[PDB]
Amino acid sequence: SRKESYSVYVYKVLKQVHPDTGISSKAMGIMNSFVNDIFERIAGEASRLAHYNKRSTITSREIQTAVRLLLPGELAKHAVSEGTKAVTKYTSSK
């Protein structure tokens, strides 16, 4: 049937910073399974952040704390500020 994936959304990032670059099949699955794992670390730490503060709600604040825990040092400085651009751009729209 249908296997959902993140394979298509890699070519929309691979062709942003290296537009003359292909990527193999068996290397797609790593960047596929990199996403699904780094998804449920951030979600599965934001999930356990909901119980620790007695709320049933995953806000966009709780994903920010569950990225300042998993990412160390200098990735935790960029991937926070690479999200709050994509939210402030999002909320000024619609």
């Binding site: 068996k26 699955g29 790593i30 399974s33 990199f34 699904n36 794992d37």
Partner: protein, 83 residues
């Protein structure tokens, strides 16, 4: 199905070639009876954790995500096969 003498299938150069990937120049002749021991310890802590997943879904085939889920359990994550 039973096929014995296959801890002796990890041959004498194929442990030397694994030694060369670790950056090892000179080895002894008594690593070969140590490596086969430490290897079967590591496969009696993965297959023992993999089969309890495959038995739990009542599958007869230990599939690709099963082993990755077993290696997820020990804290040694394997990318590239899913999971």
């Amino acid at each position: 199905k039973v096929l014995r003498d296959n801890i002796q299938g990890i041959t004498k150069p194929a442990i030397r070639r694994l030694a060369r990937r670790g950056g090892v120049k000179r080895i002894s002749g008594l690593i070969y009876e140590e490596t086969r021991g430490v290897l079967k310890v590591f496969l009696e802590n993965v297959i023992r954790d993999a089969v309890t997943y495959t038995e739990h879904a009542k599958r007869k085939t230990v599939t690709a995500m099963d082993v990755v889920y077993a290696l997820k359990r020990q804290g040694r994550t394997l990318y590239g096969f899913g999971g």
